[PDB]
Design a protein around this motif. Structure first.
Motif, short mmCIF file in Angstrom:
data_model
loop_
_atom_site.label_atom_id
_atom_site.label_comp_id
_atom_site.label_asym_id
_atom_site.label_seq_id
_atom_site.Cartn_x
_atom_site.Cartn_y
_atom_site.Cartn_z
N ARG A 1 31.13 8.74 6.72
CA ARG A 1 31.27 10.21 6.18
C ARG A 1 31.76 11.37 7.27
NH1 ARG A 1 26.07 13.08 8.64
NH2 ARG A 1 25.05 13.90 5.82
N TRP B 1 33.85 11.40 8.98
CA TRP B 1 35.75 11.25 9.12
C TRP B 1 35.97 12.02 7.54
CZ3 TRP B 1 35.75 4.81 10.76
CH2 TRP B 1 35.19 5.06 12.29
N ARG C 1 35.40 13.32 5.50
CA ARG C 1 34.25 15.15 5.70
C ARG C 1 35.56 16.03 6.02
NH1 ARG C 1 29.36 16.54 6.43
NH2 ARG C 1 28.03 18.40 6.77
N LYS C 2 36.23 16.05 7.06
CA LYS C 2 37.70 17.02 7.23
C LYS C 2 38.46 16.25 7.58
CE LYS C 2 38.34 20.09 10.68
NZ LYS C 2 38.06 20.36 11.57
N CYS C 3 38.36 14.59 7.81
CA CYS C 3 39.38 14.37 8.03
C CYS C 3 40.12 13.11 7.43
CB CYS C 3 39.08 12.87 9.80
SG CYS C 3 39.62 13.84 11.24
N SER D 1 41.13 12.18 -1.30
CA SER D 1 41.44 13.90 -0.49
C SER D 1 42.81 14.33 -1.16
CB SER D 1 41.48 14.23 1.36
OG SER D 1 40.72 16.04 1.59
#
Length: 18
Positions: free
Chosen positions: A3, A5, A7-9, A17
């Protein structure tokens, strides 16, 4: 960790994504 990572990675959020 996942999570942290996904998240916004992209490192873990490639197709998720995109």
């Amino acid at each position: 960790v996942a999570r942290g990572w996904g998240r916004k990675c992209p490192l873990f959020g490639k197709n998720k994504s995109r």
